Design a protein around this ligand. Structure first.
Ligand SMILES: Nc1ncnc2c1ncn2[C@@H]1O[C@H](COP(=O)(O)OP(=O)(O)O)[C@@H](O)[C@H]1O
Ligand SMILES: Nc1ncnc2c1ncn2[C@@H]1O[C@H](COP(=O)(O)OP(=O)(O)O)[C@@H](O)[C@H]1O
Ligand SMILES: [Zn+2]
Ligand SMILES: [Zn+2]
Ligand SMILES: [Zn+2]
Ligand SMILES: [Zn+2]
Lengths: 797, 797
DNA sequence: CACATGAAAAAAAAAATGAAAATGATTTCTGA
DNA sequence: TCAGAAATCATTTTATGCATGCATTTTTTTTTTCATGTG
C-alpha cells in the first residue's frame, strides 16, 4: 500500500520546481512568509490536483465544472486523495441555507421529529414534512424563506420635486431602457388617468399609491403592472450582478407575516411536534430548537425524555446529533444558533463550520487542506481546536494546515517551511521535518521566531491616554451587548479583544463604524441599536481598511492606486526624449489611447474563444504583454522603458527613484509594510486580501493625516507570518504617532500585548457575554483574573 | 483508524431497512437477480451518498452542484469514502474528448514531446503547445476539432422534383415560418435570377450553389449568407437539443482540409517534432503515435533513443506513460487507438477506459463502485481483468462490483447476495460472506447456480442448418475486416463471438444491420463497406432490440406499449355499470378528457416551483395519484378499479385476467420473459435498459411472425443473472421455433453453448482480427484449437 | 361456408414548441 | 515656490424592449378492413 504523498516538479507561482515527500495520514503544517508560495503549494497546486483528479472522474454533468476546472503545473504527483479545501472564501449567500442545513444537523433533527413528534393538539408524519425547503413543509406564503421583500419608499424616490417625465427614479433613468421606461410611464399616464409630468410631491397620494400598485391591460405593445411587479420580473430576468446589487439595495426584508418568520408551515410547528420535553424545561418545537444556541440545543437534546418505545427508534439519531453538536462545541461555536442564516457568518465562522461538518460527515481517506483555522478564534479555545484536528486525522484523513500559530506546531507530525525570502526569492523549500531541526535551522525565519532567537518585544513605554479626549459610545444594545458605554482613547492604539461571540464585531463594525461613517463621511448606514456616540467633534473622517480589492479591473494596479504611477508618468514626460518628441504625461498611462496599442487596448492579454472551451488569455503579438505601443516603449528614463519600470518589483523600485523623494517615500512605506516583492504592474484583481489591506494602509500612512482621522481594522493578522506582523505593527505605530486613533479587533497575543489600550469584552461568547470585563493598558489588564485575554497576557509580559 | 463500511436503514426502491457491514480496502461483489435491488444498493444509495457527501463540501458551486444530486433514504452510513462510479452512462460526447485525453496519457505524451521534440531539419516549446484544446496547438481552420460540418444538397431536399415555393427543402416546411422562408427565397429569386415556383431539378445549378453559399445582395433589405450558413447559425443559436438533432441529423462531417484529421497546427505537428526513434526503423510524430494502437504505441515507446541528456529528464515521463499503457493493455483494450473519439466508443469500451484511467491516476482512499465491467470483454481476457482490478484494491482503495461472472467471484474478498426475488417480495439480504457460505446457502439462487446445483443445460439436439437458405454477406471489408464473406443460417439461433475488437459489431450492427434495415424496413442508414448481401429475399422485415426506452413520456406504459391496455379498457367499458352509464372505452384512458382528473391532466402528479430550488412533483390532492375522476374510478370490474389494475404487477395481473386469453397470452409472455415484478402502471422513462429489452422481446414474441422475420440483438446478457439468462434463452428458443432467425453478439459462453450456430471472429482483436477462424455447431468450433472461444467451450461441451 | 374474434394497417386527435456605475486621468487652488 | 486634496470629465461597459405566433412532431386513440382459423 501507499503511505507517503510524493510531489515532484511543482513549478507553479514563485515555487522553483519544488518537490516534496509527506507522511500520509498525518498532521502536516505549512509555514512561511506571506507570499512565499505556501498557499500556492498547499491550495493552488496540491488541493487543485486532488480535487481535479476526482471531479474529472465523475461521470455526471458530461463535463468537469469550472470550465475544465484548472490544471496545476506539477510534473509527477502521487499518493493523493480526493482533496477538500476549507477556507474563508467558501462563504455563500443562498437564502435557503442555514447553519442547521450546512452542518446537516437539521436533517437528523427532521428525522428525529418524524420518528418522535407528537401533535399534542388535544402517523402521517415524514421527515420531508419538516423541511422548509420542501413543499410539504414550507410556509405557504413565504415559500419557505422567512423573509418578504418590501420596497424602500424613500430610497427609490429621493427627489419628489422633479417632473415625472424626467424619471429620476433609478429604473426609469438607467441604460438605454430609460427612454423605454419613459414610454411606458407616459402610456400609464393615460391608462390610469394621471399626468406624465407631475412630480411625486405634487402628485396626489392616491396617484402615488396607484403608481406603486400599477395598472393592467395592454396599453402601448407593452405592459406595466406595478413597481413591485417590474422590479420582481427584473430580478427574475437578471443578466448583470451590478443590477442585482443596485435593485437589492433598496429591497427591504420583513419577517413573513403568516409564518412569523420561522419559514415553516404554521401547522407543522409545535402543533405537530410538541413531543419534545425537558431542556431548560417544558416542551419545544423545531423552530424553537433551531432558534436555540448550539450549547443550549445540545443540553436540551441530552435531557429530553421522549419515552422508552419512542427512544428505541430515536436513540441512534440522538447519538448522531449529539456527536455533531459535540463537534460544533469543540470547534468553538457555542454561541451560534441553528436557525442563523448562512449570509450572516464571518469567514472564520464559515471555516469552523465547514471543518465541523467535515469531521461530522465521517469521510475517510480524504485529503484536507485548510487555511488558517484560528482566525476569529480566541487563544483560550485554540487548544481545543487542535484536539479536533487530530481527531479528524484519527479518522484516516491527511491534514494540511497553513497556520502560523505556535500551538498548532509542536503538535503537527510534519512541518514544511517555505520561503527563504518573500517573493521571487522565496519560492524554495527551506525545511521539511518533525519540528526539531526547525529550531536548529539557520536560514529559517519561522525557526528563528519559534526558538526565541528573534521575537517581537513589548515596548517599554505605552502612549499616555488622555481622558479629556475620548470617543464614548453609550446605550449599545445591538444583538448581545447588555446596554453598555465604552470609551475609546483618542490618539493612541487601542485593541478590543474577547472570546468569539462576545460582541466585538457588533460593538465596533455595525455600531461605532456605521455611526462614524454616516456622521463624519456622510454615509447612510443603519447605526444599529445605540443611544449616543459622543466625542465626534475631535475627528474629521473615519477610514476602515479591509480585504476588499483595491480595484476590480485590470486597469488598476498598486502603481495607480497609490497615486505614484502619475508621478512616474510625469517623470517620463519630463525626460528630455519625451520632451523633444512632445509626449504628454497622460500618454504614458495604459488607460488613454496615446500610449496603448490598438489590439490590447492597454490590457496586455487578449481573449480567445473556442467552440466548447472557456475563454483563454494570450498576450498581444505587438506588445507581447507590454500593454504599450512601440513608440511609447522606446522612451528611456534613466535608461529604462516604461514597461520595465512598471513590471519591476517594489524593492528594486525603491532602489530606483532614489533622487526623487516624492515617489521614494511611498515606495519606502510600501517596503516597510512588507510589500517589497509585489511588482508595480500586478493587476489589482490578482492581489490577495491581505496584500490589499496592506497596500491600503501603506498608501494611507503618507497623506498628511494630521492627527484628525480614525482607522478601523478587522483582524489584520489573517494570513500573516510573524515578520509580517512585526512590519504591520511598525506601520500602525507610525500611523498612531501622527496623532490619529487606530482601533483593531484581533486575537493575536503579540499585537494586543504591544497595544496602548485594551478593551476585553464578555466573560463568554453569546448570551454569556456582551459586557466589558477589563479595560486599560496591557499590563493592568493582565492582572484581571476574570479575563481570559488577561490570563494569556500574564505569561507574555 | 477505520477499516469497515457500515450501512443501516437503506430503503431505496424495494430495499427494506437493509443493514450491511463490509470490509474496507477489499474486493466486494454484489449479486442478485436483475432488478432485485443490487443497482439500488450499489449506485443509488452507496455511491450516491458518498459522492453527495464529498461534493457538498466543494466550494466550486453555489451549493447547486449537479442539480443537488439526490438524498438516498439511509438512516446512517459510516466509514464512507469519496465514491466514484464506473457505469455505462459515462458516454462522453464532447467533440474535444479523445481516448488520449480521457486517460491523461495525452498529457504526459505532450510533456515528453516537449522535453524531447527535436526540430529535425528545419527551447521555445511548452506542454500546452501540443494540445488541440488550447489555441497554442489547435489549428485556425477547424479549431482543433479535426472535422468541419457540411451537408450534401440531396439528402436535405426530399423532393427535388417538387417546387421550392412551398418548402422543397426539408427545414423549409417546418412551422408557420414556411411563409417567411418563401418570402426570402422569392426575394433571392428576384435579384439572383431564379424562379420561386421552379423545382430543385429544374432550377439552374448556379441558383443551387448560390442559395447554399449566399449572395452579396439585399433580399427582404437584408443580405443572404447562404443555406448552410443560415442553418449553422440556427443550430448555434438554439439550445434545445431534442428539437435540433432533427436538423443536424442530415449534416455530413468532412476532415479539416489542412489538419487532415490530426487536430493540430502543421508547424507543431510534424515539421519540427519528428525526432523519435523506432524498434523497426525511423521516427514518428505525435499524430502518428496517437494514431497507433495501444500495443503498438507502447512497444514503440519501449524503443526510444534520444541521447543521455534527454533520457536523464524523460526517464520518469517514459515510466509513467509505460505504466499507463500497461494498465490500458491489461484491462483489454489492445486494439484501441490513442486518437479514437470518445463518441464512437461503445459502453463497455468507455467503462474499461475509465477503469484504466482510475488505476493510472493513483488516487488513494477512493471508494470505486463498478457496474458489470466484463461486458464487451472476451472470457480469455477476463482473468487479466481481475489482476488489474485487484491492483486498485492494492492502491489503498475499496472496490464494490455488481457482478455475475463466475471467475470474478471466487476472487472477491467479500460477497453479498441480495434480492432472492426481483419484486417487492424479493428485495432483502440473503447472504454476506466470503464465497464459502454462498455455495452452502440453500435459498440463494446465485449460490445454487455457482455450486452447480442447477445450470443452463446444453440442448440435446441443435436445429439443423439449411444450406439452401442462408444470409451471406460478401465483401465485408470495413475496418479490420478483410472482405470476408459470412454465412448466417436462417431459422436457427446464431451467435457471433470473438476477442474484443475482432470486428463483430462492425460486421453485424454496421454492415448487416444497416443493409437489412434499408432493404426491409425502408430506412436510409449507411450500409457500411461491403460488396454484396445475398439470401435477403427469404425475409420480410428486420427487428432490432436495444436498451432504448419505450417512449420518453409518462403517458407511456408497459400496458399501453404492449397494447394490452386497449383490451383492458374495452373490457372495463363492457361492464354493466359502464354500459348503463354510457361510458366509451376511451373514458378509461388517462390521455383524454373523459375520465382523467383535469387538474392532473391524467399524469397523477403536479409540479410545484419555488425560487432557488429545483422542480418538485407532488401527487394531485384530489386524484390521490389515481389519475382519474371519482366517477370513472367508481367502476368495479371484478372488484377492482382502473387505477387499482394499473397498480397490479405483471405477474399478479397474469394471475388476474386468466379467462381472457387475448390478454392472458400477453401477460404470460411477459412473466415468462421475467418481468413479473414490473407493475403495469410503471412510467416508461423509469424502466432501465433491461426492462425495455425484455418487454420488447415479450411483445415481439406475440407478433404473428409467420417465420419470415429476423431479429438482431446486441449483448442481451448485460446485467443479467444466470436465471434471467435462462428465461431469456427460453424466450429466444420460443421465438426461433416460430421460424424466425435470431442473431446475438454475445461473449457469455452460456448462450454460446446453447446456441445452434456459432461464428468466431478474429484470432486477436484489432489489426490481427477481421478473419473467420471457426463456424458451425458449438462442438465444431470447440474442436478447432486456434479458437479462444473453442478453448473455453471444450470444458462445457 | 357464414362468422366471430383476433389482429394488420391506416387516419384522427391532441400536447409541446418555436445608456448609468464606476476607478483613472486632468486641472485647480491651496496650503506649508 | 512647489507638492497635494478635491472636483470634474472622459472612457468603457450598460442590459434595447415586444408579441406574437400557425405549422410540424410524436405519441396515443379510434376505426376499418382482413386474413385465419373455426365449428
Ligand atoms: N447577523 C446576525 N444575526 C443574528 N445574530 C447575530 C448576528 N450578528 C451577531 N449575532 C449575535 O450577536 C452576538 C455577538 O456576536 P459577534 O459580535 O458577531 O461576535 P464577534 O464579536 O466575535 O464577531 C452573537 O452571540 C451572535 O449570536
Ligand atoms: N469509429 C472508428 N474509428 C476507427 N476505428 C474503428 C472505429 N470503429 C471500429 N474501428 C476498428 O474496427 C474494430 C471494430 O471492432 P468491434 O466490432 O468493436 O469489436 P467488438 O464488437 O468485439 O468490440 C476495432 O478493433 C477498431 O480498431
Ligand atoms: Zn412564511
Ligand atoms: Zn497589444
Ligand atoms: Zn484543422
Ligand atoms: Zn389529479
Amino acid at each position: 500500500m501507499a503511505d507517503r504523498l510524493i510531489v515532484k516538479g511543482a513549478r507553479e507561482h514563485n515555487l522553483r520546481s519544488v518537490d516534496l515527500d509527506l507522511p500520509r495520514d498525518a498532521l502536516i503544517v505549512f509555514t512561511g512568509l506571506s507570499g512565499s508560495g505556501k498557499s500556492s503549494l498547499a491550495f493552488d497546486t496540491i488541493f487543485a490536483e486532488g480535487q481535479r483528479r476526482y471531479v474529472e472522474s465523475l461521470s455526471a454533468y458530461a463535463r468537469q465544472f469550472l470550465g475544465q476546472m484548472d490544471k496545476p503545473d506539477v510534473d509527477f504527483i502521487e499518493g493523493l486523495s480526493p482533496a477538500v479545501s476549507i477556507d474563508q472564501k467558501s462563504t455563500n449567500r443562498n437564502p435557503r441555507s442555514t447553519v442547521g442545513t450546512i452542518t446537516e444537523v437539521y436533517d437528523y433533527l427532521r428525522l428525529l421529529y418524524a420518528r418522535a413528534g407528537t401533535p399534542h393538539c388535544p402517523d402521517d408524519l415524514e421527515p420531508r414534512s419538516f423541511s422548509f425547503n420542501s413543499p410539504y413543509g414550507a410556509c405557504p406564503e413565504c415559500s419557505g424563506l422567512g423573509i418578504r421583500k418590501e420596497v424602500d419608499p424613500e430610497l427609490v424616490v429621493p427627489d419628489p420635486d422633479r417632473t415625472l417625465a424626467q424619471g429620476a427614479v433609478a429604473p426609469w433613468s438607467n441604460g438605454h431602457t430609460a427612454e423605454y421606461f419613459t414610454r411606458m410611464m407616459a402610456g400609464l399616464g393615460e391608462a390610469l388617468g394621471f399626468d406624465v409630468d407631475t412630480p411625486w410631491r405634487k402628485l396626489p397620494a392616491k396617484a402615488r399609491k396607484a403608481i406603486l400598485e400599477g395598472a393592467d391591460e395592454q396599453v402601448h405593445y407593452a405592459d406595466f403592472e406595478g413597481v413591485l411587479a417590474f422590479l420582481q420580473r427584473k430580478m427574475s430576468q437578471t443578466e448583470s450582478e451590478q443590477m442585482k446589487e443596485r435593485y437589492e439595495g433598496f429591497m427591504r426584508d420583513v419577517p413573513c407575516p403568516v409564518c412569523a418568520g420561522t419559514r415553516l408551515k404554521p401547522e407543522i410547528l409545535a402543533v405537530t411536534l410538541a413531543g419534545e420535553s425537558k431542556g431548560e424545561h417544558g416542551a419545544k418545537s423545531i423552530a424553537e430548537v433551531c432558534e436555540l444556541s448550539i450549547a443550549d440545543c445540545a443540553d436540551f437534546l441530552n435531557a429530553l425524555t421522549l419515552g422508552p418505545r419512542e427512544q428505541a427508534i430515536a436513540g441512534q439519531v440522538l447519538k448522531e446529533i449529539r456527536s455533531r453538536l459535540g463537534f460544533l462545541l469543540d470547534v468553538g461555536l457555542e454561541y451560534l444558533s441553528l436557525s442563523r442564516a448562512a449570509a450572516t457568518l464571518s469567514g472564520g465562522e464559515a471555516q469552523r463550520i465547514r471543518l465541523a461538518t467535515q469531521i461530522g460527515s465521517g469521510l475517510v481517506g480524504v485529503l484536507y487542506v485548510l487555511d488558517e483555522p484560528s482566525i476569529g478564534l480566541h487563544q483560550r479555545d485554540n487548544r481545543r481546536l487542535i484536539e479536533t484536528l487530530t481527531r479528524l486525522r484519527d479518522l484516516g484523513n491527511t491534514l494540511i494546515v497553513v497556520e502560523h500559530d505556535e500551538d498548532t506546531i509542536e503538535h503537527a507530525d510534519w512541518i514544511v517551511d517555505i520561503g527563504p525570502g518573500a517573493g521571487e526569492h522565496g519560492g524554495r523549500i527551506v525545511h521539511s521535518g518533525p519540528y526539531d531541526e526547525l529550531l536548529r535551522n539557520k536560514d529559517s525565519i519561522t525557526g528563528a521566531y519559534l526558538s526565541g532567537r528573534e521575537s517581537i518585544e513589548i515596548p517599554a513605554i505605552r502612549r499616555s491616554v488622555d481622558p479629556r479626549r475620548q470617543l464614548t459610545v453609550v446605550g449599545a444594545r445591538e444583538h448581545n451587548l447588555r446596554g453598555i458605554d465604552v470609551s475609546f482613547p483618542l490618539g493612541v492604539l487601542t485593541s478590543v479583544t474577547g472570546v468569539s461571540g462576545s460582541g466585538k464585531s457588533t460593538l465596533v463594525n455595525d455600531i461605532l463604524a456605521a455611526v462614524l461613517a454616516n456622521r463624519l463621511n456622510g454615509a447612510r448606514q443603519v447605526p444599529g441599536r445605540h443611544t449616543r456616540v459622543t466625542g465626534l467633534d475631535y475627528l474629521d473622517k473615519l477610514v476602515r481598511v479591509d480585504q476588499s480589492p483595491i480595484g476590480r479591473t485590470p486597469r488598476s494596479n498598486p502603481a495607480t492606486y497609490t497615486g505614484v504611477f502619475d508621478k512616474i508618468r510625469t517623470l517620463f514626460a519630463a525626460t528630455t526624449e519625451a520632451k523633444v518628441r512632445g509626449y504628454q504625461p497622460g500618454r504614458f498611462s495604459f488607460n488613454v489611447k496615446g500610449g496603448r496599442c490598438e489590439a490590447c487596448t492597454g490590457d496586455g492579454t487578449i481573449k480567445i474563444e473556442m467552440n466548447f472551451l472557456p475563454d483563454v488569455y494570450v498576450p498581444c503579438e505587438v506588445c507581447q504583454g507590454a500593454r504599450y505601443n512601440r513608440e511609447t516603449l522606446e522612451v528611456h528614463y534613466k535608461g529604462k522603458t516604461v514597461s520595465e519600470v512598471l513590471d519591476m518589483s517594489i524593492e528594486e523600485a525603491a532602489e530606483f527613484f532614489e533622487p526623487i523623494a516624492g515617489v521614494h517615500r511611498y515606495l519606502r512605506t510600501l517596503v516597510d509594510v512588507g510589500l517589497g516583492y509585489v511588482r508595480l504592474g500586478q493587476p489589482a484583481p490578482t492581489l490577495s486580501g491581505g496584500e490589499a489591506q496592506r497596500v491600503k494602509l501603506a498608501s494611507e500612512l503618507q497623506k498628511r493625516s494630521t492627527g484628525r482621522t480614525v482607522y478601523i481594522l478587522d483582524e489584520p493578522t489573517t494570513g500573516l507570518h510573524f515578520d509580517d506582523i512585526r512590519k504591520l505593527l511598525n506601520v500602525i505605530n507610525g500611523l498612531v504617532d501622527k496623532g490619529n486613533t487606530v482601533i483593531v479587533i484581533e486575537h493575536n497575543l503579540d499585537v494586543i500585548k504591544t497595544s496602548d489600550w485594551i478593551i476585553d469584552l464578555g466573560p463568554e461568547g453569546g448570551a454569556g457575554g456582551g459586557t466589558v470585563v477589563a479595560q486599560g493598558t496591557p499590563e493592568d489588564v493582565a492582572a484581571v483574573p476574570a479575563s481570559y485575554t488577561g490570563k494569556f497576557l500574564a505569561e507574555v509580559v
